[model samples]
Target: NLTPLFEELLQQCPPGGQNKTAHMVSAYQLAQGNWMPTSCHVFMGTISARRTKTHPYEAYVKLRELVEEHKMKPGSSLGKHNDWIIGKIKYQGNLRTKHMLNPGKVAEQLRHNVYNKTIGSVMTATGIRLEKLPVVRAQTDTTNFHQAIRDKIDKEENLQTPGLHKKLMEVFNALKRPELESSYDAVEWEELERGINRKGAAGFFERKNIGEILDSEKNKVEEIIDNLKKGRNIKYYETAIPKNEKRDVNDDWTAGDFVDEKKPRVIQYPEAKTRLAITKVMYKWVKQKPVVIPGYEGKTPLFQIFDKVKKEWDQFQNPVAVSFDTKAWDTQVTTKDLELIKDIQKYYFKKKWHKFIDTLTMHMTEVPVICADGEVYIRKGQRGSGQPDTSAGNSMLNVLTMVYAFCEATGVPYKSFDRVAKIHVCGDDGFLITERALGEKFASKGVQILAEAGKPQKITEGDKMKVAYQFDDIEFCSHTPIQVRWSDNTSSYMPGRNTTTILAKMATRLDTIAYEKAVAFSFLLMYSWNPLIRRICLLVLSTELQVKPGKSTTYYYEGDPISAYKEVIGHNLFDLKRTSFEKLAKLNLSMSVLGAWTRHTSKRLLQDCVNMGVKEGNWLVNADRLVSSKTGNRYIPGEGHTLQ
Candidate 1:
């Protein structure tokens, strides 16, 4: 029965602690012959009896009996069971506060912050009597658990930084427009049509639906201008979207999947016509003065660049890669900053487009948001002002302009790769891969520049910033951490923590009709590229295929997990021939991909470089011409060039 292991684990658990016995008993029951507890079961039995009105001991005994009789698969239906337990245990209260069990929130906090408060202190605060027995002690321990969570939620919900607006105004005022020449013609309908079709066509539009307005004929410049002139005052409707589960219900809202209906994200939706026109104008403005730095378009291009850099520079042999993300990038952007950007655009854009830019800027600042509570409020920030779609392009432009200004003021070479390290900026995220010393210097300077630009670094819980660095593992545009395994002389990529969370969610939907389709789609979009994730997806899918053979045609591949895996991973399962439900249920998959070897032969490396250069568009020609002119080296077939 493996009672000895449970007894040993229980013996090791410190006495007089909250939830000590409940945790041990729950762990033992959920073990299900597996050595380690399932990720889903680890957070079980958290709510106190007083809060749920059901003793922890009573709940544990019932759960144990259910498990013994094979009446439930606790791991598979953890959420349902947890919900049932919570529903039964919920205390009858007329108070405004609702005591709901959110195991996800509780487990996440436990992983990060260990509870250190004395049991006596907790009891005093929660008004719950303490007892020495396992069940009673566990119940008392969690009585104050919800209180701590509520306090954390309240703190995040009401966070305010002093002088934030003033700082933004000052930063905007200090930015001076650069003297630049451009061949941009605002009246050139042909060029505008080309620009609109390229990127702005996909922008959200009220009159012409998303991705519908292809040519200038459908979305005429005259109509856009007329609408802009007529509709001087833009209106926004306030609507709430769901926040991420990890985030507190009261935390600041941003655009994301609608996961939690209870928590509403009150975001303003701008007038579609005005937003579409702004997107068109901004598209024309940026096409001429494009701010997106080269070699930062997509993951493949960036990977190629990093690969080239590693081979070219000896300092990159064992380099460190650091990444940083700006906190509340769009919301923090002030009206003053938008004005500064408009002014900067005025300097380069043709005089004919100046009026249109001004009109666009007017729509962006001091916009009104109509809330559901029958109250109208003016939006302070630049986010909801028809710019969310174009924010990535404009935000990068603003940040880069500020960085250039900082460099100008400090007398540092802005584009010099030697003096100041090359820092790649993509919207609010920045990444640097180089020697530790240079990386450190770049990180310090990068933070300073971001602060000056009025975009501070986002710091997560446990005082950790969105910034992360590793000597061998690097997270880039893909958001997947690519580890350079020096010991194996190979480099491999793995799914991030968020992927695991998604997997856990996917597991709970196993019984649904769309489970196979959902898993297949998730594999196609997210998990397929990475070999490790591919394996995990296959394991989960294989188990499903075995259990429900009749539903084989649900997915296009006729429910063949092997073929699906091959389609995504670009290789066969190899030795991963079969997997069982038990394997999937265990929830601890240690499989990994034997990725591409780091050490490559000269022929393969040269071929790869040429292929990537071709994909990057005119890179080979540019590089060869520059090299030939500067160092008298020429590219020749079958023989490497030598610098003279």
Candidate 2:
């Protein structure tokens, strides 16, 4: 029995919750040799065997055939089949048909391959390449390239408006509320201060220095206000680092510079602090679309919403989902629009906070970026300063809100809908799911609204509006693909396009590093939130451990017993090699258990929601609440460290 082997592997894994038990059961079955590979597993193994260098053409033919065969039912099951096909092709391995393969294990391998392929394609398409060159030459070239872009931006006319400050004050005066007092309590102020200290505060003061200032000061809030009043100019320090491939310096060079010492120098700490405070206030008061925060749970929550919509809206014979993205959102935000947003916020904010609002408004007018080359460029637009707060996103939402309000006031009618269909917004990205009867009308109306709001829809070549029928593929919240299938009327959520870019980098490290040293690094994949990706990583590492000589025992028990015996006897036969595959297997098993636990919890959560009559949009909110309450961890937002 491999009980001890499994236990040793489990020792390396982090402590799991209710998911550990099912993993143990699977482990027991595997140890007892009672597990059996399914037909799907055999197919995966066959495809993998065909991927050998000697059978390249055969492997391609096999994948093509599988892809064709699986075209019948193109839902989640199709994803599973495609994954197995892709996994086997990317991760060439030799496995006996009799060798038991868990579906989870196969899924893990599939996700791993998909990630590599997706990331590789993205890097190539985006012209982001890593090259080894002389550090001095690379840095100089990068700096020159950045300076060219700066000059180009500087040459653009009408960036800074005439009498911009006076116009800003006029806008502020039109919206200011001077009679009321600040409604924020000491507790709220403390939270804001904590966020300012812990989070990345843009501009002059270093984050650590800000923390020190807060600690040393008697009244930290007032101290921050004084500091804000002192500095009006935002300073930028330009430095180049190695994150690009060496190429001819041209306009297409998209690699960015390291500004503000380490971060991008935009608005100063005073502006950043005020913007964040305003963001908090907006979060408390505004009824806009939920802003998907970055560094959170990636687009999983967004995908979950799509899944829910598909399931609930199955009654529509020809439902379609249309996605729209705003073109140059930063550049589109006008100074007047920014002022108008501040005015709207003033109505909701108390009198004491009006000065802070006014300060932010005035600061937006003459905001200038002082680069390392001793050049000062005024940020022409109101909201494109790239402050470390949620102002840009909030501003965009406010514009959309006003557009919708205008449409309502002017009686701009939308097509009739049997049920309520709400548009979901994540920053500048908007997604709508409705029946085909109303899809075109709604999409047209959406375009009209954006055009009227001054943030026209992105209609460039590849960035054009996307419209998909009931059975067509659609992308939402970045490159998260959802396969809509006609046969089963089902939608399957796949990994986001950018999800595996970082994983590819990690895999590159594994390939470059020493075998023994890289073995520990392999376990890092187990922490992936995406179960398929996590499993793929574990399986890939395990396969690599078993195949690569000098890393593990090369003994084969089939077809060459004499040679296997010789190999086994060459070392101490009594001493087990303790192969790294065992560790990976344990991780895979643990994840499988955890996956089941999560599903169980999700089902229960769904039932609770159903019982309480929760709407589709708020399902994720409730799910987040339930998960956070149980785990003592909250979902932050955006793809967390998965994308660049």
Candidate 3:
């Protein structure tokens, strides 16, 4: 984004726009209060902030001490007990609330206060000195490598990327790697047998060779042209006369009555002209000998002369005979709109159909995997206390209940959110509900009449859990990511790490708190089983990894499995968006002019929300017609970190 343009957008969404109709509302909302995270169109992968960046800035300051250049000691903690304190978290923070990224507080509160040495190691190892490295902390949960790099230069005059993260470029550059060179895999076509089978007449192969023909006729099949016309097939052309029935040769339009006055007659062909003729004959026998054509010839001088000459040279200009060879009539069967409609049916998701169920399942894989609380949980087969029995905060409940309040406010009379008699939270983390209230307010509003207490049940057999009208499924799995079934496939999904990922509030320190949220979020998305999704995620992920950013210096898996891995490992990023949307859209368009398709929801969002194409649902259906069609857009995420 240009500086001015981004500033404008930054100004417009302070707390972010209120979105009641989006599934990603939670994660999106998390970044609202903090700096609006810089989002890529279809972010190749997750970009996150982590606790610390190991660099030799500590050494630079030490050199400053030798030259008396600057004060020379590294400060803060990276000790063992400090790691333990940072690990005690189980809560995945919410987007709507303030996040706690107070690294100093977390490190200080450790039961064992051994931070000085962890920080002191770099000091001893690098040996280079700095007057002192500023303990500057990041205020946003998300940031970029460029900005982070610029921010990390403490001694501006002597700044070069510290060795701790100098190789980060290798990671970021990996996004540029291509997917595959050849489309050939195996025979490359599953239907090769059906496609290449030789089943013309469906007869079995016998002792006779396949190419042999029982009734071969070389004379009939080969060209019969004489040497003069060798190699060319002759097509009979029956000579046709230009009809002169309606014209006057003279400039004046005065002769509509012109016609042959002599009665037509046919004469027999001479014997020589019949069987012995080398060339076929046509029409000559019918040429008339001039008769003083009644009154027409006398009417014009030129007509009189033409009639006299016609008698003397009639056979020279006339066709002698006509052939009786077969006349073939062409029969045509046509279908006009086939190609156009064929193109359209290729798209997996059409805006109008929503195919809500299919789209969700296809991209997500039927197995529900949400990486919440830093643990990988599968919803399809969750063997747990049943669904979590956690309670909804009064604030969230109020917002939900406001559905009725909203109806009342909008002056529309309809069932509200309270009509939702049930709420189910079946996820890696426990689920909860509000206590049912049976007052007139509750009943009128359709709020379920809950007993004094909101009951909870584990998903164990014989638990006899209360049935709720609402359904809560688990997030994408952390360990195994799923692919988006679309053409480009970059939009793959992984159950999110705990809500804390998007929910992590801005903090001042670079210690554990700063990066865990972003790292986990990126991890859940990066580890997907789908190639396309994995590639794209890897693209954005490798951006700032010049530092080889590892996983979880300190964080928890409230319910996110992607965050639970012991170490960090990543892969290449993807950038095939252009061909994906275009190919899909063009291919589908051939089926019909019915509608248009676009690549990502981001494109739709920018178009509909900012450009106004989503004036109605139909507009979205034919999204290619929307306003501000972009020819191109590109982004590369970066990696830079700091210790709190």
**The candidate that achieves the highest lDDT relative to the unseen native structure:** 1
Best prediction by TM-score? 1
Encode model 1's per-residue lDDT on 1-644: one tens digit a residue.
44433322322121122344433333334333322221112111111122233433444454444334432221112222123222222223211122221222111111121121222222223222222111210111223433422322111111112333343334433332344333334444444444232222121122342234444344554477655445433232222111221111211111111112112132344433444455455544444244433323222222233343344233554465556566545554656656656665665666666776776666555443322222223334345422433334444444454344334334455544334434554444445555555554545444434443445455433222233444224444334433222223344332332333333333332113234443443443233333323433432332333343222221233444444434543333332222222323222232111111122322332343334334433222112222223333332222121100
TM-score to true structure, per model: 0.45, 0.43, 0.17
Count backbone clashes in candidate 3.
Answer: 91
Q: Of the pair 2 and 3, which is ahead by lDDT?
A: 2
lDDT per residue as tens, model 2, 1-644? 55344322222222222222122232233344433211111110111221123332333333344444543321112222123222323222222111112121111210011223322322233332322111211233435534443432322112112233233344334323444323432225554453343323323222323344446542544554544334432222111122222211111111111111121122222333433434444433322213222111212333244454455456566777666566545445566656655665555456655665666565554344332222323444334333433333343343244234223323443222214343444445446566675665545444433443455566543322466774325554433433322223332432233223323333232111123212212222112233233323322332322333222211113222112322422221112122223323433343234332233533443343333324323211222233334444332222111110
| Ranked by TM-score, top first | 1, 2, 3
- Alpha-carbon RMSD, each predicted model: 23.0, 28.2, 42.9
lDDT of 2 at 153: 30
lDDT of 3 at 294: 15
Output the TM-score of candidate 3.
Answer: 0.17
Backbone Cα, N, C clashes tallied per candidate:
1, 5, 91
What number of backbone clashes does candidate 1 have, counting pairs of residues 3 or more apart or in separate chains?
A: 1
Candidate 2 regions exceeding 4 Å error are 1-190, 193-221, 226-305, 308-317, 372-374, 388-420, 442-452, 460-464, 483-495, 498-532, 539-644
The whole-model lDDT of each prediction reads 0.35, 0.34, 0.21
